[PDB]
Design a binder for this molecule. Structure first.
Ligand SMILES: *[C@@H]1O[C@H](CO)[C@@H](O[C@@H]2O[C@H](CO)[C@@H](O[C@@H]3O[C@H](CO)[C@@H](O)[C@H](O)[C@@H]3O)[C@H](O)[C@H]2NC(C)=O)[C@H](O)[C@H]1NC(C)=O
Ligand SMILES: *[C@@H]1O[C@H](CO)[C@@H](O[C@@H]2O[C@H](CO)[C@@H](O)[C@H](O)[C@H]2NC(C)=O)[C@H](O)[C@H]1NC(C)=O
Ligand SMILES: *[C@@H]1O[C@H](CO[C@@H]2O[C@H](CO)[C@@H](O)[C@H](O)[C@H]2NC(C)=O)[C@@H](O)[C@H](O)[C@H]1NC(C)=O
Ligand SMILES: [Mg+2]
Lengths: 1135, 362
């Protein structure tokens, strides 16, 4: 299998099979040296290779593909670089007591250490534990990058493997390791160490399961440190191999950005063979002044075919501006994702958890979302189950008014006419109690006014009322754990939230339950510990769909053994079907209307659970459990016998009553959905629920308000045929005719040419509740999915109910592929992790007991009410910022590096520069590459409390108007205009070429014109960022002035230094001359004047929505809204 | 706990002035630009119309001249004053001889007699123009050596192959000595001698002195210093051979501390035509009338159809005279005014009113 030895110095030149590096594993370090050969060869000192017209497919291809993705990745090479060294320590090298291994230093990252991991240290590889400081090795595994769950499962090193612990007992083990290879797995590993002792000095085994194999993608909490050899390598850790299935290549901008770079090269190779055809017409003239005073050949061919050592000194320099762009947006997107993380209003104050971005790359793709895919249970409902109602032998007293607001659609009663009726009934529950130790602060229980004089005491209805009431709290799956803060309170954890909804209520119902111990379960009487017990448990499973138990009922009379009875509960599939005709409770005037009282509970939208009872035989009571130890508990539990034995004797089933379970919403969801669906985002609810309690909440959280078509699918068939006979079959014709009827009732637009599309928000409001088994027959084949799309595309908010968790990821791939449209997928749970990875932005709700949709997410908002604060504030800012600075980067290079070409016509294209050797270097590094970072970070077009109030500003993002290629070609032509102003305005000062000095001495070098050209280019495209940004301020307005006088202070320092040849005084010669300052105030104007006119013509006469809002914002329409405002909050006014 | 540091910067609550382009912040910004750049466009052309120049081209003075005085054919001179608009007293050449002392292609002292009816007032500058001498090629302007300019020593490889500036064609002859000003710039120097005084002719014979001290910047001798080696193994570049016919002795070593007409030629002019200062007079005024100077021709310009010449001037604070930099303010002023009275001709009759947010209230 696999080979890892111990205490070897791990040589490099060895081949021997004792060697660990002779397996030749890769590192975790998965370029810069290629960038260095560019800048050295670019214009000056060390030109390695300048071959001419043969590198023209060599440099333009590497920077757009091989160097774009190297800079694009902000978590594969940045979270891999800053993690080193992860606590390199000093207990190393010199060590004594011999037979003790002298410690070594191999590399930075290697296999063969005893290097610890402390608190908040990202573990460098997969580790098996050896020793700790606590008792029983009280440590665990954490689930932040690769592992997924919430609980802290204790994991032990073996009790004699934990003999070595000190730095005196550190180098006191040696054994070889069996391991496995690449498998793309998470929870599977094999191994066994026959390790060497400390105390005895002998060799002894240790079994290995998966749970001691903690992973690389971890960060430890709540404990100080642990020890171990770095057992497994880092290069085989599968988190980068499992996550993600997509390379998260970004969006409609950074996948169309690399086409915008090529247009920069294509419209600059044209101006290199216009130079090429104009330098060949110079050699064949021979009446010019290049022969007398110049000593060369009487021919062409400087390097090859003319002066090409200049031409490929510009192409190799203009291949540094796309390299500067990719570094420019990976400081903007790292900062636009670091102000989501530092925002106090995207903070889950109940859980102390900010909106943590799990992808620093994408924030721009938030600002152009128009499909939100969600999940009802978890992501827009509260996802804690609580117990509201119950029916008991006919009577179902009191109604906790939560969701009769859509069964009574036409008006709501929460104002005074139904809430305060039952709020006074809720005060009638809480103002007095019949039993003490009822918690009465977190109860919200099945409220109980009085049955017989407030205490309930021949009334056989009460005799079997409290029979099942204690039984749902007696026998259940979870065990009542204790609160460490106070012993009087009892917390309850569960993986099934409905089952702990019963037990937490039945304590607060009455007869206050405290202790569920294997010692026993008490019932208070006499002051003595009267105490019950259970035998066993029967597990609720989705293959079983029901739950029973095995409970102990004692023999309470002397000289006789009485008769017991067993419990049954679950979903109503087979419950109503088995009739009762032999017991005391038959199908009568009670049993059918209580089924109707459980049919009514779904009509007001509750999780209808039932409770039932069992029949047996007296002498078979021991025979019923004597075959269970050999056939059910021994080996055949997961096999199909537990369903067979739960059908054999119970051929008929005895039903008594039912328990109603209700789910609240999360906070601010009916305001958030109201907020997002008016911003232009067609949101689809992909639920795991049936129709009439997913459309019930569909009017509760106001995504459905007016239109929904009444649909009767009424089918029970399947489709085993594909070839012909379509009107012969029932189900495939009827749902497809339903598509074309509700086309032809709403418009004859059955259509085959898919290439028409608007991203506009639909005009007629519509809604679809498709039924799970219909979309499986609608997403199946060709030409039925496209009949499904343009039906759903013509709607406000469709709903898809009873959707399989593979069908969730298929319907989001359908819109993302067959339309050109990116989607969003919000989630919490392992049933739509495939939906998160499918959509281009996957938001994930965190903090619960299930968090596999959190570390696999793209963002980590606390509640759903932050989604309209992430998308509508931090998302549309990240697209009005960044679809503006991207054409502000291909403008400010050709305001400067095109005057190298315009001094070709006044140089006969012979190849002299016009700038320093440091005005080519420090231009796109210090002079003007600083403020286009800050238009990318500090440009709030409207305020944070204004984009929430007016959410329809987000419709700029959907329609793709802030970014298209035609906006880009009017900012390269804006550089090609202002590179004849920034050059010919210091040319026509010198065109008759007198002195230009007050002191008469004159200054006409090539480099004293490129101080007239650079300094009126850096100012005339730093104001151009200042004029075009919204919200001038104190931080970006400061560093747009300290980039306007770095050009005046890098001349005044480098030119005054003697190390700059031709220069001793280009400060005083140039800046103290009145001819610089008289043309500095003209070409700053003539560069701004054709755009401050157009920005004033467009913002007066054909304005956009983002100035119409911010000029109302200074009249004072938005004065009364406070700072620090969000409408989607209950604890604050909405005004 | 991890509430994320509310400090009015991470929530981006920076104090911010929020500019809005209405016709309340724009028309007082186009009118204020249109009224400045016309009264600056008038103040500059007031300064830059009083500037007087004298430009005489003498490149053809060997061929098309006589031993007697003959007027210049007037495609070789132009000059304008601010008191005399129309002025047509033409200057005249006199080509003295072919003196037959190692006679070259182009030699013989052309003596130009010009006539100025005004005063180049306090600082009088004697430049020289050079049209069609393209001195900005790739190999030309990168060919000198900064060790020799700053005065220090040089090996053969310190001047032959160096980064950027290198004396790549011109570091050794067949003998293999080190040229002391190596490079195609200093080798091809303008060596027409100029008089140190403009003679007064016809009226007074009180001469007008013109020194070449302080002919470029005072803070420039800290890189043009004296040489460090005095060797006989250095020799002039192959075009200075008429001036030093036998090499450098112990006496004729050129101190480029103060040989200041060479410090102007070591900045190669960046365009077609080239004007470098060669005679200044910071002491006296230039009285009006008529003068004559004596240029000794040594620079063979005629083969590439180029030009030489004279540029005698008095400089302003804006340098010499150029009608551009004053007329482009009144182009920069009478366009932002014309784009102030178009964006109000449309605003009063298009007429948008500040209203509800359109396209979402449609
Ligand atoms: C300084 O003035 C001299 C005039 O004496 C300029 O002319 C150059 O003079 C040298 C010396 O005679 C010429 O070199 C010789 O050229 C002939 C061909 O005419 C050749 O047969 C000889 O073997 C020798 O190489 C040189 O050609 C001539 N320049 C030109 C362009 O013909 C000289 O240019 C001036 N130096 C400066 C301005 O630095
Ligand atoms: C070295 O050469 C230079 C010129 O190449 C000589 O300088 C000349 O000396 C004579 C002597 O009277 C003067 O008339 C000339 O005017 C000088 N030339 C210049 C340009 O001024 C120098 O004398 C030579 N060295 C020796 C020791 O003779
Ligand atoms: C002032 O100028 C006169 C100019 O007069 C003639 O100049 C030539 C050459 O400059 C000279 O060869 C003649 O000898 C001069 N005299 C005559 C009568 O032709 C010169 O004298 C000096 O350059 C200057 N003199 C003074 C005193 O400043
Ligand atoms: Mg869910």
């Amino acid at each position: 299998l696999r080979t890892v030895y111990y205490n070897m110095p791990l040589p490099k030149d060895m081949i021997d099979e004792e060697g660990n590096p002779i397996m030749q594993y890769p590192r975790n370090k998965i370029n810069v040296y290629f960038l260095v050969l560019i800048i050295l060869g670019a214009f000056q000192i060390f030109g390695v290779t300048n071959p001419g017209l043969s590198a023209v497919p060599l440099v333009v291809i590497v920077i757009i593909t091989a160097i774009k993705d190297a800079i694009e990745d902000s978590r594969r090479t940045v979270l891999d670089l800053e993690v080193n060294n992860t606590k390199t320590h000093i207990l190393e090298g010199v060590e004594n007591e011999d037979c003790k291994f002298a410690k070594n230093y191999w590399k930075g990252v290697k296999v063969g250490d005893i290097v610890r991991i402390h608190n908040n240290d990202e573990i460098p590889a997969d580790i098996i534990l050896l020793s700790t400081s606590d008792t029983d090795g009280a440590c665990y595994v954490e689930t932040k990058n690769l592992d997924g769950e919430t609980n802290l499962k204790v994991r032990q090193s073996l009790k004699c493997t934990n003999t070595i612990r000190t730095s005196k007992d550190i180098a006191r083990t040696k054994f070889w390791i069996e391991s496995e290879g690449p498998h793309s797995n998470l929870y599977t590993y094999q191994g066994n160490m026959k390790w060497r002792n400390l105390a005895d000095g002998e060799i002894r085994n240790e079994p290995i399961t998966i749970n001691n194999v903690l992973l690389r993608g971890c960060t430890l909490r709540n404990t100080k440190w642990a020890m171990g050899v770095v057992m497994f390598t880092g290069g085989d850790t599968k988190i980068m191999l499992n996550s993600g299935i997509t390379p998260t290549k970004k969006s409609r901008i950074s996948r169309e950005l690399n086409f915008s770079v090529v247009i920069n090269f294509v419209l600059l190779f044209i101006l290199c063979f216009v130079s090429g055809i104009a330098n060949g017409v110079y050699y064949d003239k021979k009446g010019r002044s290049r022969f007398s005073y110049e000593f060369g050949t009487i021919a062409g061919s400087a390097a090859t075919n003319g002066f090409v050592s200049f031409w490929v000194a510009v192409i190799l320099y203009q291949s540094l501006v796309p390299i500067s762009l990719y570094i420019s947006v990976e400081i903007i997107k790292t900062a636009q994702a670091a102000f989501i993380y530092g925002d106090v209003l995207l903070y889950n104050a109940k859980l102390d958890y900010p909106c943590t971005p799990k992808s620093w790359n994408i924030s721009d793709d938030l600002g152009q979302v128009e499909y939100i895919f969600s999940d009802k249970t978890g992501t827009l409902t509260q996802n804690v189950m609580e117990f509201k109602k119950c029916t008991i032998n006919g009577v179902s007293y009191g109604r906790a008014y939560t969701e009769a607001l859509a069964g009574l659609r036409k008006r709501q009663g929460i104002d005074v006419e139904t809430e305060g009726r039952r709020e006074k009934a809720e005060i009638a529950k809480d103002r007095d109690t019949m039993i003490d130790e009822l918690r009465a602060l977190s109860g919200n229980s099945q409220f109980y006014p009085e049955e017989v004089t407030f205490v309930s005491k021949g009334e056989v209805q009460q005799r079997c009322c409290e029979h099942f009431m204690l039984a749902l709290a007696l026998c259940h799956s979870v065990l009542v754990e204790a609160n460490p803060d106070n012993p009087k309170k009892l917390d309850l954890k569960a993986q099934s939230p409905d089952e702990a909804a019963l037990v937490a209520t039945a304590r607060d119902v009455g007869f206050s339950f405290v202790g569920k111990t294997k010692k026993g379960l008490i019932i208070e009487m006499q002051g003595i510990q009267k105490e019950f017990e259970i035998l066993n448990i029967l597990e609720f499973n989705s293959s079983r769909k029901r739950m029973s138990c095995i409970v102990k009922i004692p023999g309470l009379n002397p000289g006789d053994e009485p008769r017991a009875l067993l419990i049954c509960k679950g979903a109503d599939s087979i419950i109503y079907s088995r009739l009762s005709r032999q017991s005391g409770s038959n199908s009568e005037a009670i049993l059918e209307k209580t089924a109707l009282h459980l049919e009514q509970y779904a009509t007001e939208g509750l999780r209808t659970l039932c409770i039932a009872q069992r029949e047996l035989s007296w002498s078979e009571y021991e025979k019923w459990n004597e075959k269970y130890d050999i056939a059910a508990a021994s080996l055949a539990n997961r096999e199909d016998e537990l369903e067979v034995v739960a059908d054999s004797i119970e051929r008929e089933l005895i039903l008594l009553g039912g328990t109603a379970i209700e789910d609240r919403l999360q906070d601010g969801v009916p305001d958030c959905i109201e907020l997002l669906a008016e911003a232009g985002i067609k949101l689809w609810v992909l639920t795991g629920d049936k129709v009439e309690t997913a459309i019930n909440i569909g009017f509760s959280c106001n995504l459905l308000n007016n239109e929904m078509e009444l649909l009767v699918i009424k089918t029970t068939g399947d489709d085993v045929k594909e070839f012909g006979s379509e009107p012969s079959e029932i189900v495939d014709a009827l749902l497809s005719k339903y598509l074309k009827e509700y086309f032809n009732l709403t418009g004859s637009e059955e259509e085959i040419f898919e290439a028409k599309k608007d991203h506009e928000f639909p005009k007629g409001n519509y809604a679809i509740v498709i039924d799970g088994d219909a979309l499986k027959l609608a997403l199946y084949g060709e030409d039925i999915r496209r009949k499904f799309l343009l039906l759903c595309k013509n709607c406000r908010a469709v709903l898809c109910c009873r959707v399989s968790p593979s069908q969730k990821a298929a319907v989001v791939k359908l819109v993302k592929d067959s339309l050109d449209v990116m989607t969003l997928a919000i989630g919490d749970g392992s049933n739509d992790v495939a939906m998160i990875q499918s959509a281009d932005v996957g938001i994930g709700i965190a903090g619960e007991e299930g968090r596999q949709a959190v570390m696999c997410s793209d963002y980590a908002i606390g509640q759903f009410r932050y989604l309209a604060r992430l998308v509508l504030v931090h998302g549309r800012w990240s697209y009005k910022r960044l679809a503006e600075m991207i054409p502000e980067f291909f403008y400010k290079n050709m305001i400067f590096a095109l005057a190298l070409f315009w001094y070709g016509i006044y140089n006969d294209f012979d190849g002299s520069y016009l700038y320093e050797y440091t005005y080519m270097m420090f231009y796109n590094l210090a002079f003007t590459s600083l403020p286009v970072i800050f238009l990318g970070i500090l440009d709030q077009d409207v305020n944070d409390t204004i984009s929430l109030v007016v959410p329809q500003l987000y419709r700029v993002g959907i329609l793709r108007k802030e970014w298209n290629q035609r906006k880009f070609l009017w900012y390269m032509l804006d550089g090609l205009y202002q590179s004849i102003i920034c050059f010919f305005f210091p040319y026509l000062v010198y065109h008759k070429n007198m002195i230009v000095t007050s002191n008469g001495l004159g200054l006409d070098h090539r480099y004293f014109v490129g101080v007239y050209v650079t300094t009126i280019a850096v100012i005339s495209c730093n104001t151009y960022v200042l004029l075009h940004q919204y919200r001038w301020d104190w931080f970006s307005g400061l560093f747009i002035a300290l980039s306007c006088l770095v050009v005046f202070a890098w001349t005044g320092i480098w030119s005054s230094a003697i190390a700059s040849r031709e220069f001793f005084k280009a400060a005083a010669r140039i800046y103290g001359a009145p001819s610089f300052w008289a043309v500095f105030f003209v070409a700053v104007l003539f560069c701004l004047l054709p755009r401050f006119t157009y920005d004033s013509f467009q913002k007066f006469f054909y304005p956009t929505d983002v100035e119409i809002v911010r000029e109302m914002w200074q009249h004072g329409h938005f004065d009364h809204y406070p700072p620090g405002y969000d409408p989607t909050d209950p604890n604050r006014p909405k005004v | 706990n991890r509430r994320p540091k509310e400090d009015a910067f991470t929530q981006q609550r920076l104090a911010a002035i929020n500019p809005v382009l209405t016709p309340r912040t724009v028309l007082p910004l186009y009118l204020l630009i249109a009224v400045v750049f016309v009264i600056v466009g008038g103040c500059i052309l007031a300064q830059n119309s009083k500037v007087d120049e004298v430009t005489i081209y003498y490149q053809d003075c060997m061929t098309n001249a006589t031993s007697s005085w003959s007027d210049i054919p007037s495609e070789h001179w132009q000059f304008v004053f601010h008191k005399y608009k129309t002025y047509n007293t033409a200057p005249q050449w006199r080509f003295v001889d072919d003196e037959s002392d190692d006679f070259t292609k182009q030699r013989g002292t052309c003596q130009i007699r010009f006539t100025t009816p005004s005063d180049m007032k306090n600082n009088v500058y004697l430049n020289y123009v050079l049209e069609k001498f393209a001195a900005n090629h790739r190999r030309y302007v990168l060919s000198f050596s900064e060790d020799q300019i700053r005065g220090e020593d040089a090996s053969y490889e310190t001047v032959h192959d160096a980064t950027g500036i290198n004396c790549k064609p011109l570091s050794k002859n067949a003998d293999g000595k080190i040229y002391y000003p190596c490079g195609l710039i200093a080798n091809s120097m303008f060596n027409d001698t100029f008089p140190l005084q403009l003679t007064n002719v016809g009226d007074t014979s009180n001469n007008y002195s013109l020194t070449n001290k302080g002919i470029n910047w005072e803070s420039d001798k800290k890189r043009y210093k004296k040489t460090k080696y005095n060797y006989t193994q250095i020799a002039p570049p192959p075009y200075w051979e008429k001036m030093y016919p036998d090499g450098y002795n112990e006496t004729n070593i050129p101190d480029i501390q103060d040989w200041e007409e060479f410090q102007n030629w070591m900045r190669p002019g960046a365009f077609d035509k080239i004007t470098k200062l060669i005679r200044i007079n910071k002491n006296d005024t230039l009285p009006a009338g008529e003068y004559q100077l004596d240029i000794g021709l040594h620079w063979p310009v005629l083969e590439f159809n180029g030009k030489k010449g004279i540029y005698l001037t008095h400089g302003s604070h804006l340098g010499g005279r150029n009608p551009f930099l004053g007329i482009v303010y009144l182009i920069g002023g009478c366009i932002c005014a014309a784009m102030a009275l178009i964006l109000l001709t449309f605003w009063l009759f298009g007429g948008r009113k500040i209203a509800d947010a359109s396209s979402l209230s449609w």
